[PDB]
Amino acid sequence: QEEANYQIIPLPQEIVTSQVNPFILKSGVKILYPEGNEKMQRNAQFLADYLKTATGKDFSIEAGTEGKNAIVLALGSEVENPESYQLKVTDQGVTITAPTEAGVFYGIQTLRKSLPIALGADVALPAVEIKDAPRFGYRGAHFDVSRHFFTIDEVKTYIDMLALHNMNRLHWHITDDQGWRLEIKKYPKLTEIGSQRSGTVIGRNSGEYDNTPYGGFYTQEQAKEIVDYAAERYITVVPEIDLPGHMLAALAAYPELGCTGGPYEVWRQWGVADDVLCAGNDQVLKFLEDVYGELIEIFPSEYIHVGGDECPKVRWEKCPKCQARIKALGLKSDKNHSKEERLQSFVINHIEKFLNDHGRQIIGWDEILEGGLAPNATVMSWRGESGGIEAAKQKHDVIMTPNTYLYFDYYQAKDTENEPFGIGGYLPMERVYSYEPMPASLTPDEQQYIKGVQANLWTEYIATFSHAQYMVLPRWAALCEVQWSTPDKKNYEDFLSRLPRLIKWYDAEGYNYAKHVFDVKAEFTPNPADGTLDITLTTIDNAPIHYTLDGTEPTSTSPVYDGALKIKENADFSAIAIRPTGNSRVVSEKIDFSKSSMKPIVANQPVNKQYEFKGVSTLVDGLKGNGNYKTGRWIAFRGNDMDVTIDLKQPTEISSVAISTCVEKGDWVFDTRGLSVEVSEDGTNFTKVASEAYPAMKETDKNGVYDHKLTFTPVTAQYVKVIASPEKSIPEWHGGKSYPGFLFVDEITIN
Numbered sequence: 001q002e003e004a005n006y007q008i009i010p011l012p013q014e015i016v017t018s019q020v021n022p023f024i025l026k027s028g029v030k031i032l033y034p035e036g037n038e039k040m041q042r043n044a045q046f047l048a049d050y051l052k053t054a055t056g057k058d059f060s061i062e063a064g065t066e067g068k069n070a071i072v073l074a075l076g077s078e079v080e081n082p083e084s085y086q087l088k089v090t091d092q093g094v095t096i097t098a099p100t101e102a103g104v105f106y107g108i109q110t111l112r113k114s115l116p117i118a119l120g121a122d123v124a125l126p127a128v129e130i131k132d133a134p135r136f137g138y139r140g141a142h143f144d145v146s147r148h149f150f151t152i153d154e155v156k157t158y159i160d161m162l163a164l165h166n167m168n169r170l171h172w173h174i175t176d177d178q179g180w181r182l183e184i185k186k187y188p189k190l191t192e193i194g195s196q197r198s199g200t201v202i203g204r205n206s207g208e209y210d211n212t213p214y215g216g217f218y219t220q221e222q223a224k225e226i227v228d229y230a231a232e233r234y235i236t237v238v239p240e241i242d243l244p245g246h247m248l249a250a251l252a253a254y255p256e257l258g259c260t261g262g263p264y265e266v267w268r269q270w271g272v273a274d275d276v277l278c279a280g281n282d283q284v285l286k287f288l289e290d291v292y293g294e295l296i297e298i299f300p301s302e303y304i305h306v307g308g309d310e311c312p313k314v315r316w317e318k319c320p321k322c323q324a325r326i327k328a329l330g331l332k333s334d335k336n337h338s339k340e341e342r343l344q345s346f347v348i349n350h351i352e353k354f355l356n357d358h359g360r361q362i363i364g365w366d367e368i369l370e371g372g373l374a375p376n377a378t379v380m381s382w383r384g385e386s387g388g389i390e391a392a393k394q395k396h397d398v399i400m401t402p403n404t405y406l407y408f409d410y411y412q413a414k415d416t417e418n419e420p421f422g423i424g425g426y427l428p429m430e431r432v433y434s435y436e437p438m439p440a441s442l443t444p445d446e447q448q449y450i451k452g453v454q455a456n457l458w459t460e461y462i463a464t465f466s467h468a469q470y471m472v473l474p475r476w477a478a479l480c481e482v483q484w485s486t487p488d489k490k491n492y493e494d495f496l497s498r499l500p501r502l503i504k505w506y507d508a509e510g511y512n513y514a515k516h517v518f519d520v521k522a523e524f525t526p527n528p529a530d531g532t533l534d535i536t537l538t539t540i541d542n543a544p545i546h547y548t549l550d551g552t553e554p555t556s557t558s559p560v561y562d563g564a565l566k567i568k569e570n571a572d573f574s575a576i577a578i579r580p581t582g583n584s585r586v587v588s589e590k591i592d593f594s595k596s597s598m599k600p601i602v603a604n605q606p607v608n609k610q611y612e613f614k615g616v617s618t619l620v621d622g623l624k625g626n627g628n629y630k631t632g633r634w635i636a637f638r639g640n641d642m643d644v645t646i647d648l649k650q651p652t653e654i655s656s657v658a659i660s661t662c663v664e665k666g667d668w669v670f671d672t673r674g675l676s677v678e679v680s681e682d683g684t685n686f687t688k689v690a691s692e693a694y695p696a697m698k699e700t701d702k703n704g705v706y707d708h709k710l711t712f713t714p715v716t717a718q719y720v721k722v723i724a725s726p727e728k729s730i731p732e733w734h735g736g737k738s739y740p741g742f743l744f745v746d747e748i749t750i751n
């Protein structure tokens with residue numbers, strides 16, 4: 001028999017539990033909703049759908065206030081927070097009570113996420129009282145459907161994914177330079193021409209082009225379908241028709257809207273286009289009024305996103321019409337703004353006034369601060385937090401989407417080679433979760449202007465919905481705890497222990513996701529005291545870890561990890577986590593163990609401060625490095641030799657010393673010019689037993705790892721001094737001729 005678990009994502013405010021019998025969830029149980037409430041009937045059908053993917057069973061939906069062996073949805077308690085709820089469980093029944101139908105829905109999402117996926121099985125719901133409410137009223141995700149186009153069905157899946165994470169906003173970015181995606185009745189060419197490009201660039205603007213005509217748009221009926229589908233799941237769809245930049249698709253369709261007058265093409269490549277709407281053209285203002293006039297008939301959202309990001313002023317500076325507008329308005333350059341930044345403020349003010357007259361407010365990207373903020377504008381801070389902080393100080397509402405924390409087109413792993421191709425950056429789960437949306441630099445009163453938190457998905461490098469899921473799951477799980485949970489409840493270790501129960505729902509709903517959190521985490525800790533390299537292995541779900549030391553594939557039949565592996569000998573280490581769902585990536589490490597490994601070592605000359613890492617002890621930990629000299633497997637020397645003494649602890653017969661170096665000549669990192677081995681009985685007086693000089697490197701020599709080994713007549717020694725020269729004088733062919741080069745070394749092996 002299965003048991004429910006209320007330790008879910010996002011973590012509720014208040015969870016109690018008692019020593020009373022649980023509620024058994026078997027065939028016969030009913031869901032009750034208030035007579036004649038369409039939303040609460042839809043809430044009941046949602047619970048039934050969820051209970052059907054969790055248990056294998058159907059549960060009847062019926063009108064009612066009262067029932068034995070029943071789950072009762074009802075309205076009640078305070079309206080302080082409209083999205084709050086109360087989930088009480090006894091052996092007799094289940095109550096989900098909220099001040100609105102949306103609060104009942106988030107109460108239902110909590111019951112949903114508490115359940116395991118166990119087909120054919122009855123489930124025990126332990127006796128509990130859950131009081132919960134979101135911290136932020138605006139909890140959103142953005143979706144770029146211009147750069148690559150996504151179908152109605154894919155956008156609905158995105159909306160189902162929002163609901164599972166208690167998010168109440170879809171920011172729908174439906175126009176840009178590379179495609180216009182909404183049918184407009186007055187301007188048919190916005191879709192006939194504006195929705196089509198000749199092809200798409202390959203890689204990061206590489207000059208190679210995929211000459212496949214690419215396009216797609218939504219009809220006004222299809223866009224209404226999305227509004228309605230989102231509205232059932234208590235999600236407001238905030239549309240963005242980005243202006244006055246990111247408008248090449250509109251210019252291709254109607255070139256008179258641009259400063260030069262064309263020619264313009266729908267853009268095949270990525271980045272920022274200089275060709276923007278002409279602020280000096282009365283046709284452009286009429287055009288925006290007409291487009292936004294049609295937009296607000298489709299999208300009832302009180303808030304409408306006008307964009308305002310990355311609008312270069314270069315065309316405006318040279319345009320006689322834009323300069324005539326500037327002259328007539330008396331716009332001036334001062335320390336706060338250029339004339340052309342004041343001209344942008346005029347455009348944002350014009351569309352705000354039109355939308356305020358039709359009962360709507362505007363959101364803009366933090367660039368709308370340029371030339372003075374529109375008096376009623378909400379600011380979406382994306383260029384870090386600083387735009388939001390300045391907006392809050394001017395008493396304007398802020399939605400935080402900082403690219404330092406919440407740009408989910410960025411890589412979510414350091415090892416970008418093994419990731420799907422992306423724009424760049426590094427936003428791992430831990431970084432996303434560490435985000436505190438309320439800046440420490442704002443006064444309490446200024447903090448009330450932080451209304452929302454949202455993560456953006458730009459799709460320059462996202463062509464499939466499966467890859468879009470990979471990029472947002474499970475990073476949305478971290479985001480939604482930030483959006484929802486109180487800041488004092490946040491603990492990263494605890495969140496990661498809750499994540500696997502949410503991934504089970506990703507699996508059951510057929511959602512793709514990144515699997516980095518499921519990896520075996522390996523720590524290699526030197527133990528000088530014991531003369532061992534201690535390997536510790538962990539998973540977030542504490543799944544069974546199987547390992548090999550002999551270089552064979554680790555399987556379900558290999559030895560099981562029981563506690564620290566104390567390595568005292570050569571080893572091809574490999575470990576894997578065994579999971580019903582599918583096995584983890586294999587974590588592996590070559591352990592090069594010798595007479596030097598975990599022995600005391602001293603620097604006789606200085607280690608380079610910049611590339612010191614864990615220090616000289618790095619050269620006797622049994623670990624080797626690769627071509628990348630920045631990992632901490634390598635320590636560097638510059639302006640003096642690697643000159644170290646290793647204490648073998650007692651007199652010992654030795655016959656060889658081996659090192660590796662890391663070469664990157666472009667970075668002034670060169671191979672050693674000579675290696676030497678001296679021995680002592682007393683630790684003061686050393687005698688040379690072997691050496692070799694290496695010639696200066698030539699232009700055609702490879703970068704990467706070089707191996708250097710000296711053999712010699714067996715000799716008895718307690719102390720071994722190993723000396724390696726860097727390049728004191730970089731050779732003539734190289735730009736740094738005569739300057740000293742870096743030397744990087746990873747390990748001193750002695751046998």
Ligand SMILES: CC(=O)N[C@@H]1[C@@H](O)[C@H](O)[C@@H](CO)O[C@H]1O
Pocket residue numbers: 271309310365382407409423458459460
């Ligand atoms: C407000 C904003 O972010 N604008 C652009 C966006 O078109 C682009 O896709 C993204 C890259 O991550 O960032 C900026 O270049």
Ligand SMILES: [Ca+2]
Pocket residue numbers: 618619620621622623624633746747
């Ligand atoms: Ca090492």
Ligand SMILES: [Cu+2]
Pocket residue numbers: 258259277278279280281315316319320321322
């Ligand atoms: Cu112009």
